[PDB]
Structures are given as structure tokens and as C-alpha cells.
């Protein structure tokens, strides 16, 4: 209900909806050639328990977690104020935003066009996409 | 009982009788201050010496001194 | 603020000196009768017996040099712009480049990042 | 903005610096022993 | 009863965190003094010393409730983690006896790895006495995976409460009207919390008992233990382990309740397999408590018109000696957030003590009675918790007459009389304290005299037969004959401390018919002495907090004030908070003597070993049959023989309990710096150091000043308690590990 | 008092300490990984005794040392463990003193003691060569003070 709290809430939704989509378009992309084909022998070597505790990938994930830090340390102040960081994509978007508003009469609020639906669809779908494939060994009951 | 002695640092802001419990001090017209008041303690026989005027006393070194003297029924604050 | 500016600039000059300090040596220890062949060979080969004495003497002499360079900066009563504005930028560009150049050799073979 | 002012408080700065001083000493007694040369 | 919400009242901004002392304008504009640094934290929790708008005070304390609640959840979520990453709970699940408890490891940095106690189970570390392993075994937890899932599930609940205490405030906010619904509050605390809580855990230990009862008590390996869902997915498995589950909620509606007798029983006593109470009696117990709370949770006016209310209930109770009795107590508790806290701290404080007694008397957890370190630690733990809580009850029952009591608004002639004949209450308690002191401790002086004098202690033997086995002996005999006679449906006593000559042993003695004698009448009256003195000084601080004979204008000064001055012969330490400061000390003496009594008397006559060639041989075999009557035996055979288990441990892994033992006397005697000296001399001591600070200008802008007169005593009692608990904390954790 | 490499009453303590540790060492299986670290711990124990033997140490096995200034034992007092304390402590102290010099000015004195801009804390590194410069500035402190102290009356 308050300003500064819902700010981080809607931001975190946007800051992860793209992450919850490039990962889906990344996990599907890496397994597009091994989705079926005898169910990839129950995910084959892609099973996390089969991995050797990420021996070779741990030192790589540390580098990724480092660069991703400053990436979000650019996202934290670029959101602050309009100028510089957000202002240049500001008038860029305003170029399609003007045409989209012309198609949508007075203004056609883009956040109602698809800022919340995409943001929540990615989160909910990725939450269910991580449980059906990574959080169930014995099914017991058939899953449909 | 207790011996009340008033310094020459008085400003006359009446802090004594405001703080003071049983009204030992008293404001008197005086010709050598800014506000024109001076604290004076006639009823020193009834003084208890609780030393709550030195708290409200403004001056760098307090203006109302009460040196500890003898103790009687009037200065012990007892009801028996 | 101002304190970072002064440091951030002095270290930028130290950087610009460090690359040229290694450019003459590396180009001397790679081709033509080099006193140091591969980067893995002469990593810590001792020389003569004193060794540490000439090192500590070089340390003391360089320390006295910076001692005078600082004490002179105190005196003189110096002072109490676009070139300075470009220099404030390339100083930051220097400090972050000279850590990475050595980070290269710290990879043993400069290949562990890309998996194999 | 104001988060840096809260980061600049006496207790936060004190705990941060004391964490640095304590961790350096934990790593010192874990790594090389004092060589000490006469 | 109405949804009245004031959405958005305080914004979410770091602006207040930038200002040190935003909660008070007096603690913001003038931080020029060292005393301000301590005042910022002393008044940080005195929420009634900021704003008077109750709609905001209620919206600053329920926030602190959720904050403290989040701290507790962060605390509990780690306990399940420590018993999985580095511990021995699974190995202890297979072998419970030889493997000592442990759930804390040290690192090789400065040779501290000596603290790694060899407990067994392929894992070394520090022994634990928190009862975690007993609780986890009583919860059916076997695999390490069940620890991590509970911990990760605790992180979610811990985060939701932070986003709740930050919700009803910076985001939402109920009105003031939502808090006078005390009628609607007890209908949800006694039925939603107590009721559904006693029912939810009841429904758990009915389907999770057999992984502990009809499995781990038979002799199956932890790997052969089936899964908890395999018993629910197949009702016939529960049906075979209990031939009552075949029905499946069919005689529950037919009122054929006797067909549920395989899990729901009233046996009594302990089980001769686990080591504690029956796993089937507690399930029926919580079911019985749940239904009682589902009934007791419907007693006050909601928004349908039926039921009583705290209003007219108290508006109806009268009484001859009370006059206008009980009336206005509704306005007492529904207006002062403080007012609820003393009755809460009082009841809950005595509750922690009473539940501590119920711990050792009837051990409710399996493998808890034999675990002597855990049992000894838990009793005294809740013992001291309730000591602090009851003194806090006095601390705030003193707050009420000063901060929220008026001679026009809230009125009970009962509380009026407690303040009208106030000089009579304490006079009675005073004479009671003196009679219980000049005798209970007088007899200690008497007996200690009789021994050093000669043949007087010899002729005291007949009096040693008196008092002891004279009273309370018939009470135990009532409980011996209570089953069968006055308890036809009970085949055992309330606890084996009642059943005479009935001893239950599982390679180590669990409980014993505590045969009173020699000096239990002595220590129980030392207790009653230290109890009446504690109640006296705290109740004195309660009812003398408003009207005092010496100084009539008492309400003007406050609660945490030094004094008035050298007048009237000397007005010094007259605040009710000082009656709590010293009330903490007599509570300290009370709880100290009680923990001494409990701890030592246990191994004296209760705790021991068993052999077939004989019968019972205690750790310390029946010593306080004589060494308790005199003061000397309390430091000749008690405080002296304990150094052989706290100091003779540097060669082993119990060296830390000796360092903390000798170091707790340091901070305790460090309290002797503040409790004896005065601010005047120390303030003359700074200005010399400030002179040295003015010599080099190294004087801080914050002018160096001494501690406050009240803050010095608050720190003094803090050290007198911390240094006065960590010694016995190191002592209770010293012998019990060596003689375990 | 003889050195411990020749003091036969010191090596016996090493043997006795390892003997007391060995009973705790042998009760558990050495092949277990959670107790394979005990051999590394006793390696630390062994690697600790050899350095102290060089220092003169008590015949009793309680290893004593020297603070008179003897150049053979300057390592236990004078040079290392002592002078660094003085420098490191005073590198903090004179840095604090420089911060005390910049504690006045217009912005409130209380704000410049507590809520300081982090930049002053980052400048702390200035004091590489305190000694005589600090002596000058401390002279100036006593000087500009001009004997302005408390009354004490
Ligand atoms: C020469 C630099 C150096 C090196 C090589 C190490 C190396 C190591 N440190 Mg360490 N540390 C350092 C500096 C260094 N530290 C400094 C400057 C501090 C603050 C004063 C710390 C504080 C610290 C703590 C608190 C801990 C470690 C720990 C560790 C060990 C593993 C965890 C880790 O830190 O991962 C990588 C480091 C980062 C991601 C940062 C590892 C061998 C852990 C340990 O094993 O305890 C001994 C641990 O608890 N370090
Ligand atoms: C208040 C609860 C609490 C307490 C008292 C401790 C205490 C401890 N933890 Mg722990 N921890 C906790 C909660 C807690 N933890 C939670 C909720 C998690 C996440 C599930 C962890 C996860 C964790 C890991 C992964 C490790 C520890 C470790 C440790 C020990 C090393 C000390 C340390 O570095 O931390 C700091 C201690 C303090 C700052 C003082 C206690 C704080 C209270 C509130 C004051 C120490 C005895 C380390 C260890 O034991 O090595 C195996 C270790 O590696 N903890
Ligand atoms: C800084 C060191 C340190 C830390 C971080 C911990 C942390 C912890 N200890 Mg521990 N302990 C320590 C030193 C420490 N201990 C020492 C030196 C001893 C003597 C050898 C013990 C003996 C001990 C025992 C016997 C037990 C613990 C237990 C525990 C856990 C229970 C939580 C708790 O007590 O919260 C903190 C409690 C407080 C009162 C601190 C809050 C008050 C303010 C912040 C101070 C916890 C993770 C229990 C456990 O089950 O382990 C998992 C347990 O039974 N400890
Ligand atoms: C008449 C009330 C009553 C009584 C006598 C008990 C008694 C018991 N409870 Mg219990 N409990 C109660 C109410 C009660 N509970 C309610 C209302 C809840 C819901 C919050 C719980 C939730 C609860 C849990 C989650 C657990 C227990 C457990 C236990 C057993 C060991 C803990 C203990 O000794 O503390 C006893 C507490 C009291 C004596 C205070 C109750 C007094 C009320 C206010 C009257 C024990 C026999 C533990 C267990 O099952 O043992 C294996 C366990 O883990 N209780
Ligand atoms: C071994 C030291 C010692 C002794 C022998 C006593 C003895 C006594 N105290 Mg005392 N007390 C002590 C230490 C001691 N205290 C300390 C250190 C404090 C500071 C916390 C207090 C604070 C204190 C208070 C606030 C009060 C007492 C009271 C009493 C008297 C209770 C009446 C009685 O039962 O008479 C028995 C005689 C003997 C046992 C001999 C009693 C004579 C109470 C009192 O005056 O009577 C009601 C009282 O209110 N004490
Ligand atoms: C009718 C079902 C029932 C069952 C099966 C139990 C079973 C049990 N209760 Mg319990 N209790 C009950 C109802 C029940 N209670 C009710 C209605 C109340 C009042 C609200 C209590 C109040 C109560 C208290 C205060 C305590 C127990 C305790 C206990 C345990 C001690 C063992 C024992 O001596 O037997 C029965 C225990 C009795 C005290 C006798 C029956 C209860 C009353 C007094 C008759 C035991 C497992 C003790 C405990 O929690 O263990 C730590 C304990 O101190 N109960
Ligand atoms: C500057 C003067 C001074 C000093 C240096 C000490 C020093 C000490 N006093 Mg002492 N005391 C003093 C003045 C002083 N006192 C005065 C003026 C009085 C009033 C007359 C007292 C009254 C007093 C009492 C009543 C007691 C002490 C005790 C102690 C010892 C505490 C043991 C300890 O934890 O140390 C350090 C040891 C450690 C193991 C550190 C713990 C490390 C943790 C685990 C971290 C200690 C060596 C206590 C004692 O030991 O009895 C002899 C004790 O009970 N003092
Ligand atoms: C300088 C000597 C000295 C001093 C001043 C003390 C002082 C104290 N001891 Mg200690 N003690 C000492 C030597 C000393 N002891 C020695 C040599 C041993 C044997 C190693 C012990 C063993 C010991 C134990 C086991 C205990 C104390 C306890 C206490 C405290 C009693 C708490 C109290 O008064 O409540 C009231 C106490 C009574 C009315 C009795 C007290 C501060 C107790 C304690 O500290 O509780 C936290 C306690 O448990 N002492
Ligand atoms: C055992 C505790 C301990 C230890 C090992 C150290 C160690 C160190 N301190 Mg330090 N210090 C300590 C306690 C400690 N301090 C305390 C309690 C305070 C008061 C809060 C300070 C205040 C302090 C200041 C102001 C400075 C240091 C600085 C330093 C470093 C001096 C070398 C350098 O980096 O230049 C050094 C590593 C210096 C530093 O590193 O600058 C950032 C520095 O100027 N310390
Ligand atoms: C010592 C003492 C004081 C003075 C108490 C003081 C000065 C408390 C000192 C405590 C602080 C915390 C120590 C100073 C440490 C600074 C906060 C610096 C810390 C910086 C880093 C280490 C974090 C009294 O005011 C007093 C009053 C009445 C009776 C007895 C006494 C008494 O004995
Ligand atoms: S306290 Fe002193 S200055 Fe104040 S009114 Fe009284 S005499 Fe005047
Ligand atoms: S001595 Fe005490 S009673 Fe008399 S005026 Fe001063 S404060 Fe009041």
C-alpha cells in the first residue's frame, strides 16, 4: 500500500520475470535436444544428485555471482531518479510508447498492456517448472 | 537545623520555590538583578535540605546554597 | 572526494610506470639471449649470496626519494582543468587494468576460466 | 542515500572495522607461523 | 468487532535511521554528552516515554512483538540445522546410550580443538544439554533430510513474520478500535492458539508415535524404519501396529469411544522402555487439553451478542472486605498495554518454574531422565527464566501506579484498598519474612553451632527425626494409594517420585521415590524465606509506587530515578525500579538456593547406579543425610567436592567450563565496582582525564561524563546476575558431565 | 637454566603431552575421515615445539625468556612483538588525533564525532610516517591550547 515498499515489490517482480524467462529459455534451450528420447534416461547426467558437487562449475559460479552483483549494483541506482541510466531507455521506449499510445487513444497504460501479467506468469510458471522436474523422485500417485 | 545561604549569582527566575517542596525560600524585590527577584529563606527552621533547588539553579556555580547542619524533627521529614 | 582524487591519480601514474617497467624487461626476457626464458623457469632463482642486502638498500633509497618528494610537496605553498578532467578518468582506467594484467599470469596458464 | 548515513553510524563502523581486525588475526594463526629471524 | 484499518500511517524510508535518536526529539538535538549515548539505549524500549497516542503505542509494541517473534524463529530454524550438518543425532538414533549428545564443533585456529568432546558416533564436538535430541526423537525425526526440510520451512515462516511486522505498519495499520476487542482476543488465544495448538500437535503424535513407539522401542535399525507417509498412504499398516485404526473415524461418530483405546490411554507413571512418560498418554493428554480449550475459548462477547465479557464479569464480583470490588479492572487491563504485561509476566514466570518442576518430576521426553546433564540444565533454565519474568511482573506492576493510574478514570476499590491499607500488607509480609528468617536460617546457625560445639549435634538427632518425615509424608502415601482407589483408570502414580519402593531403571536410575528427610524442611523454608522477601520487596514497589509517606509528591519524579537528596536524614534509592533492582537480587538468592537444592539433592538420594549383587548406589551416596543440616556441609561436601570436576578437566574436553567458571567471578566482582561507589567521585575522575584530553585537545566533542546514577545500578545488577549465573552455569555443567 | 634442546626435562613434557593425547587418539578409528584431522593437529603440536627450543627455556619445561634487552633475545621483547604494538597502536592513535584536529568546523561537532563521512575513515591510511610529524603537531596542540584547562577549584 505504501510507496517505497511496493516499489521494491514491483521491481523484484520485473527483476526476476526476465530472469525467470531467460532461464526457462535457457533450461529448455539446453535440453531442447534431449527433452524426450527415452526421457533422457531420467534427465541423464543433468540430474543434480549425479553432479560431483560442481567441482569445475563452482569456481565459475563464483565469477558469475561476482559480475552479477555489480550488474544489480547498477540496477539499484539506475532505478533511482529518471536521468542518465533510465532516461536514455526512457525516450527510446517513448518512441515505441508514442506509437503504442497512438494505437491506444489517450495513453493506453503499458503496465496494463503487459507488465504485471508477464511478471507474474513467469514467476508462477517457473515455480511450478522447478517442482515438477526437480522436487519429486517417487510419484506414488500419477501426476496429471 | 540546616543553614541556607544565598549566593550573589541570583537571576531571580524563581526556580527555588518552584522546585522546593515545603517552601523554604521566598522571592523578595531586589535592586541588583536583571529580573529583579532575590531568593530568601526565612523559614529555615522548617528546612529539610533535600537539595532540589541546586538542580533547578541555573548559574554555573549554583546561587542557592544550603549547608548541612543539625537535624531536628522539622528537618527529618518524619510523621512520627 | 578530494582525498580519493589525489590517491586515485598518484596510483594511476604508478600504473603507467608499471606497464613500461615490465615492457622493457619482458621484451628482454623473451627473445635473443634472455637472462630469463619461460615465465615458469626462473620464478625464484637466487643470485650470489647477499641478495637481500641490495634489495633492502634499493628499498631504503627509494624510500628516501619519496620522503623528499613528499616533504617538498608540503612546502612551496602550492595553489592555496579539462586535461585534469580527462586524467581523473584515465587514472581509474589504469588501476583496474594493471591488476588484471597480473591476474593473467596468476591463472597459471591463462586458460582455467574457459572450463578446460 | 540515507542507508549510507546509517552505514556511517558509530556502531556499524565499529563492528565493520572490528570484523576486519578479528578476521585478519583468525587467518594469521591459521596460515604461516611467525618466522622471527635474529 | 469491526475491520477498522488505518492503511499507511508511517512511510518506509531510511530517513529515521540516518538520525540517531529519531524516536525522541529530546534525544536528537543535543547529543553533546556521553550520558546521551546511554540514554539513547535506556529509553529505546520505554515506548510510553515518547508519544502518548495509544493508537501509535499499540502500533509500536505489536511491531516489537513480530520483531522479537522473528528473532525467535531465526533462533529455532538454526537448531534443526546444527543437528544435521555437524552433529551425531543419527548415530545417536541408532545407539542412544554410548553416544553422548553433541551438536557444536570447533575449528583448528589457536589450539581450541581440545573442546571437541569424544561423544561417539563418528563425530566429535561439544556436548549439548538443550534437550534437542530428546525432542527430535519424540517427534519421529530420524533422517538428516527431515532436519533440513524443517529448517528450510522455518526460513519461510521467519521471513513472513518480518514482512508482517513491516506490513501492519509501514504498509497497513489497524485502528485503535482493534485493540479494545479483548473479548474477541481471548476467544482467539484460548481457542485459535491454545485450542488449535493443543489439537494440531495432538493429531501429530497419533500418527508419528509408531515410528518411535512401535518401532524404535522394538529394536529395528534406523534404515529399516519405514516412512511416515507410508503409514498414512496405507491405513492397514497403522491398523497392524494399532488394531484400532481399521475403523477409521467410524465409532468416533457412534460414540463407541472405547474402540480407540490403542493410542488413547491414561496409564500414568513412566514407560520401562523409553525412559520417560508414555508416548500414548501424551497424545490423549493433548486431545483432552484441546477439547477443553475449544470449550474455554468461547467465553466473551464477539459480534453475535452471546457470552460473558471481561466488563460485566468484573463488574459483578463484589465481596465484603473488597467494597466496590473487581469493578474497573476491565478498564485497568484494556487501557494500559503495561497493565497486561505484569499479570502476564507473573503468571508466565511462575509457569516456567512450575513446568520446570514438572520436567524432572515426570520426564515427558524419551531418554530424558537418564540424560542427567540435559535434565539438570533444563529445570534451572526455566527456573531462572521465570525468576526474571516474575521480577518483571513486579517491575511493571510498579509502573502502573506511576504511569497509568488515576483518581477519576480507572477504579477498583480492591486496588484502592491495596493502596489505602497499603502499610498493612507489607507489615504482614515483613513479620512473616522475619519469622521465616530468624528460624530457617537461624536453625542453620543453630546446627552449625551444635557441631563445632560438640555433643549438641548428637542430641539433635531426635529433632532431625522431627519436621522431616512428619509433614508431606502422608501426601506421598496418598499418591501411592491414589491409583486403583481414587484413580481406578490409572495403573501407575503421577510419577515414580510418589510410588514408594517402586524403582524403574534402564541401566541408569530414571526416577526415585524421593524420601524426604534430614534437611528438606530446612531448604524448603530457606526457599519460602527468599520467596516472601522477594514478594515483599516487589509488592512494596508495586503499591508504594503511587502514595509514599516520606515524599508525598512521588508521581512527579518518575520510575527510574536516583533519589531526592540528603534531606530528611537521607532520601536514597526510593524508586520502585530500585525495589525491582533489589527485587532482582532476592529473586536471585531465591532461585540460587532452589537450583542448589534441586541439583545436589538429586544425586544425593535420587540419581545413581544399579547392580545385581546389590540394589542402588548413588553417584554421591546419600550424603545430605547430615551434610545439609549445617552451612558447613554446603561448602564442605557441596561447594568443595565440585572443584574435582570443573578444574580437573583441562586434560580433557571440559576445559571451557573451568575458564567460564573462573571468569564469571571476574564479571561478578566487576559488578562490585558499580554497586559500591558513587558517580560523584567518578565524575571527579573524568575531569582529570579530560584535563589530559584538553592538554592535547584530544578531548572529544561529546563531553566525557560518568554513567547515570540509575544506569550504573542497572549495569551493576546486569553483572551481578551475569557473573552470578555463569558460575553455576559452569558448575551445573561441570560435575554432571564428569559424573554422567 | 639450560636450553630445551639440551634440557632433558623439557622433551619429557613433549612425550608426556603426546602420551595424554594418545589415549584420546587411539579410542577412535584412524581410518575415519572425521578423525583423520587429529594427525594434522598433532602435526601442528610437533611443529610448535621445535621453534621454542631455540629460545632459552626453563629447565622445568616451562619456557622462560628475556626482556632486559639482551640482543640474543630481542625477538621476545624489544624488536618484533613490542615495537609493532607501539607503531600499530599509535598509527591508530595519531590517525584518531588527526581526525580530532578535523573535528571542529561548521558541521556540528557531535555529527563529526559520530556520523562522520566515510571519507575521513578512508583517509586514515595517511599516517605512514607518524613519528616526528606527529611530534610537530602535538607541539602545536600544546601550543595553541595556551594552558586553557578546567578550574579545579
Ligand atoms: C590472503 C587472502 C585470503 C585468503 C587466501 C583467504 C582464504 C580463506 N578464507 Mg579468509 N579472510 C580474508 C582473507 C583471505 N582468506 C580477510 C582479509 C578476511 C577479513 C579480515 C577474511 C575472513 C574470513 C572468514 C570469516 C572466513 C574466512 C575463511 C577462509 C577459507 C575458506 C572460505 C573463504 O574465505 O572463501 C573465499 C573468500 C571470499 C568469498 C571473500 C579460505 C582458505 C573461512 C574459514 O574457513 O575460516 C577459517 C571463514 O570463516 N576468511
Ligand atoms: C542465534 C542462532 C545461531 C547461533 C547462536 C549460531 C552459532 C554458530 N554457528 Mg550458526 N547458523 C544459524 C544460527 C546460529 N548459529 C542459522 C539460522 C543458520 C542457517 C541455517 C546457520 C548456519 C551456520 C553455518 C553454515 C555454520 C554455522 C556456524 C556456527 C558457529 C560458528 C560461529 C559463527 O561463525 O557464527 C557467529 C556467531 C555469532 C555472531 C554469535 C551468535 C549470534 C547470537 C544471535 C548473538 C557458532 C557456534 C559454523 C560452524 O559451526 O562450523 C561448522 C558454520 O559453518 N552456522
Ligand atoms: C560465541 C560462542 C558460542 C556460540 C555462538 C554458541 C552458540 C550455540 N550454542 Mg554454545 N557454548 C559455548 C559458546 C557458544 N555457543 C561455550 C564456550 C560453551 C561451553 C563449552 C557452550 C556450551 C553449549 C551447550 C551445552 C549448548 C550450547 C548450545 C548452543 C546453540 C543454542 C543456541 C543458543 O544458545 O543461543 C544463544 C544463547 C544466548 C543466551 C545468547 C543470547 C543473549 C545475548 C545475545 C548474549 C547455539 C547455536 C546448545 C546446543 O544444543 O547446541 C546446538 C547446548 O546445549 N552451547
Ligand atoms: C494443560 C496444558 C498443557 C500441559 C499440561 C502440557 C504438557 C506437555 N506438553 Mg504441551 N501444549 C499445550 C498445553 C499443555 N501441554 C498447548 C495449549 C499447546 C499449543 C501451543 C502445546 C503444545 C505442545 C508441543 C508442540 C509440545 C508439547 C509438549 C508437552 C510435554 C512436554 C513439554 C512440557 O513439559 O511442557 C508443558 C507445558 C506446560 C505445563 C504449560 C501448560 C499450562 C497451561 C497454560 C495450563 C508435556 C507432557 C511436547 C511433547 O509433545 O512432548 C513430546 C511438545 O513438543 N506441548
Ligand atoms: C549474609 C548477608 C545478609 C543477611 C544475613 C541478611 C539478612 C536479612 N535481610 Mg538482607 N540483603 C543482603 C544480605 C543479607 N541480608 C544483600 C547483599 C542485599 C542487597 C540485595 C540485601 C537486601 C535486603 C532487603 C531489601 C531486605 C533485606 C531484608 C533482610 C532481613 C529479613 C528478615 C529476616 O528474615 O530476619 C532473619 C535474620 C537472619 C536470617 C540472620 C534479614 C535480617 C529484608 C527486611 O528488612 O526484612 C523484611 C528487606 O527488605 N535484605
Ligand atoms: C484425561 C486425559 C489426560 C491424559 C491421558 C494426561 C496425561 C498426562 N498428563 Mg495431564 N491433564 C489433563 C488430562 C490428561 N493428562 C487435564 C484435563 C488437565 C487439566 C487441564 C491436566 C493437567 C496436567 C498437568 C499440570 C500435568 C499433566 C501431566 C501429564 C503427564 C504425567 C503422567 C501422569 O502422571 O498422568 C496424568 C497426570 C496428572 C497430573 C493427573 C491427571 C490430571 C489431573 C490433575 C487429574 C501425562 C502423560 C504432567 C506433565 O505435563 O508432564 C510433564 C503435568 O504436570 N497434566
Ligand atoms: C585492578 C585490581 C584488581 C584486579 C586486577 C583483580 C583481578 C581479579 N579479581 Mg578482584 N577485586 C578487586 C580488584 C581487582 N581484582 C577489588 C578492589 C575488590 C574488592 C575488595 C575485588 C574483589 C574480588 C572478588 C570477590 C573476586 C575477585 C576475583 C578476581 C579474579 C577473577 C578471575 C578472572 O576471571 O581472571 C581471568 C581468568 C580467566 C580464565 C579469564 C576468562 C576468559 C574467558 C573464558 C573469556 C581476578 C584475577 C574473583 C576471584 O577469582 O576470586 C579470587 C572473586 O571472586 N575480586
Ligand atoms: C575469593 C573467593 C570466592 C568468592 C568471593 C566467591 C563468591 C561467590 N561464589 Mg564461589 N567458590 C570459590 C571461591 C569464591 N567464591 C572456590 C574456591 C570454589 C571451589 C572451586 C567455589 C565454588 C563455587 C560454586 C560451585 C558456586 C559458587 C558461587 C558463588 C557466588 C554465590 C552467589 C550468591 O551469593 O548467591 C547466594 C548463595 C548462597 C546464599 C549460598 C559468589 C559471588 C555460586 C554461584 O556463583 O552461583 C552463580 C556457585 O554455584 N562458588
Ligand atoms: C587485537 C585487536 C586489534 C588488532 C589486531 C588491530 C590491528 C590493526 N589496526 Mg586497529 N584498533 C583496534 C584493535 C585492533 N587493531 C581497536 C579496538 C580500535 C579502536 C576502535 C582500533 C582502531 C584502529 C585505527 C584508527 C586504525 C587501526 C589500524 C590497524 C592496522 C595497522 C596497520 C595498518 O593497516 O595501517 C592493524 C592491522 C589502522 C588502519 O588499518 O587503518 C585503517 C588505523 O588507522 N586500528
Ligand atoms: C567506572 C564507573 C563509572 C564510569 C563508567 C564508564 C566510563 C563506562 C565506560 C564504558 C565504555 C563502553 C568504555 C569506553 C569504550 C568506548 C565506547 C570506545 C569503544 C570503541 C570500540 C572499542 C568499539 C561510573 O560512571 C560510575 C557511576 C556510579 C558508580 C560507579 C561508577 C563506576 O565505577
Ligand atoms: S535558584 Fe538562584 S538564580 Fe534561580 S531563581 Fe533562585 S536565587 Fe535566582
Ligand atoms: S534546602 Fe531542600 S527544602 Fe530547602 S529550599 Fe533547598 S531544595 Fe527546598
Curated annotation (Swiss-Prot), chain B:
It catalyses: reduced [plastocyanin] + hnu + oxidized [2Fe-2S]-[ferredoxin] = oxidized [plastocyanin] + reduced [2Fe-2S]-[ferredoxin]. Pfam families: Fer4_7. Its cofactor is [4Fe-4S] cluster. GO terms for cellular component: chloroplast thylakoid membrane; photosystem I. SUPFAM superfamilies: 4Fe-4S ferredoxins. [4Fe-4S] cluster 2 binds at residues 20, 47, 50, 53. [4Fe-4S] cluster 1 binds at residues 10, 13, 16, 57. InterPro entries: 4Fe4S_Fe-S-bd, 4Fe4S_Fe_S_CS, PSI_iron-sulfur_center, PSI_PsaC. It is a peripheral membrane protein. It is found in: Plastid, Chloroplast thylakoid membrane. Binds 2 [4Fe-4S] clusters. Cluster 2 is most probably the spectroscopically characterized electron acceptor FA and cluster 1 is most probably FB. Residues 1-30, 38-67 form the 4Fe-4S ferredoxin-type domain. It is an enzyme of class 1 (oxidoreductase). Apoprotein for the two 4Fe-4S centers FA and FB of photosystem I (PSI); essential for photochemical activity. FB is the terminal electron acceptor of PSI, donating electrons to ferredoxin. The C-terminus interacts with PsaA/B/D and helps assemble the protein into the PSI complex. Required for binding of PsaD and PsaE to PSI. PSI is a plastocyanin/cytochrome c6-ferredoxin oxidoreductase, converting photonic excitation into a charge separation, which transfers an electron from the donor P700 chlorophyll pair to the spectroscopically characterized acceptors A0, A1, FX, FA and FB in turn. The eukaryotic PSI reaction center is composed of at least 11 subunits. This is Photosystem I iron-sulfur center. The gene is psaC.
From Swiss-Prot, chain D:
It holds the Pfam family PSI_PsaJ. Disulfide bonds: none annotated. It is a single-pass membrane protein. One of its GO terms (biological process) is photosynthesis. InterPro entries: PSI_PsaJ, PSI_PsaJ_sf. One of its GO terms (cellular component) is chloroplast thylakoid membrane. Keywords: Chloroplast, Membrane, Photosynthesis, Photosystem I, Plastid, Thylakoid, Transmembrane, Transmembrane helix. Gene3D superfamilies: Single helix bin. It comes from the Eukaryota. The chain crosses the membrane at residues 6-26. Coiled coil: none annotated. It is found in: Plastid, Chloroplast thylakoid membrane. NCBIfam families: PRK02733.1 (NF002743). Belongs to the PsaJ family. HAMAP family: PSI_PsaJ. May help in the organization of the PsaE and PsaF subunits. This is Photosystem I reaction center subunit IX.
From Swiss-Prot, chain E:
Chlorophyll a binds at residues 673, 681. GO terms for cellular component: chloroplast thylakoid membrane; photosystem I. It comes from the Eukaryota. Keywords: 4Fe-4S, Chlorophyll, Chloroplast, Chromophore, Electron transport, Iron, Iron-sulfur, Magnesium, Membrane, Metal-binding, Oxidoreductase, Photosynthesis, Photosystem I, Plastid, Thylakoid, Transmembrane, Transmembrane helix, Transport. HAMAP family: PSI_PsaA. PsaA and PsaB bind P700, the primary electron donor of photosystem I (PSI), as well as the electron acceptors A0, A1 and FX. PSI is a plastocyanin/cytochrome c6-ferredoxin oxidoreductase, converting photonic excitation into a charge separation, which transfers an electron from the donor P700 chlorophyll pair to the spectroscopically characterized acceptors A0, A1, FX, FA and FB in turn. Oxidized P700 is reduced on the lumenal side of the thylakoid membrane by plastocyanin or cytochrome c6. This is Photosystem I P700 chlorophyll a apoprotein A1. It comes from Cyanidioschyzon merolae (strain NIES-3377 / 10D) (Unicellular red alga).
